[PDB]
């Protein structure tokens, strides 16, 4: 997971939103030791979400847990803290994480 290559390089997510996608992936996996500044733990979390080592029954990967996230509150907090309009970007990240480079 710490390697030179990146999971999100095979998706439509821009590199400026890679930490946003990794924070979504880490918060979706119910991790609590995670800190925003720790990029390594973010990469481990997104790697275990997209390529789990022990997937559950009839599930290829843990991407289905993203549907429990409340993206609206996350977009509201992003707009409050950083003055970024990213409401559609969270949806695009979610769709790309669930299926990397669909046929549109």
């Amino acid at each position: 997971p710490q390697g030179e290559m990146d999971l999100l390089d095979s998706t439509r997510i821009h590199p400026e939103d890679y930490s946003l996608a990794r924070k979504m992936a880490a918060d979706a996996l119910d991790i609590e030791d995670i800190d925003d500044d720790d990029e390594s733990a973010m990469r481990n979390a997104i790697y275990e979400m997209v390529f789990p080592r022990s997937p559950p029954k009839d599930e290829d990967d843990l991407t289905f847990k993203l549907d429990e996230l409340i993206l609206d509150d996350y977009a509201t907090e992003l707009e409050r803290k950083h003055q970024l309009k990213k409401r559609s970007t969270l949806q695009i990240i979610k769709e790309e994480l669930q299926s990397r480079y669909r046929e549109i």
Binding site: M24, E68, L69, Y74
Partner: peptide, 11 residues
């Protein structure tokens, strides 16, 4: 110190 934001999950 503040508290790190944790994304709420559907219930």
């Amino acid at each position: 110190l503040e508290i790190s934001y944790k994304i709420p999950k559907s219930q």
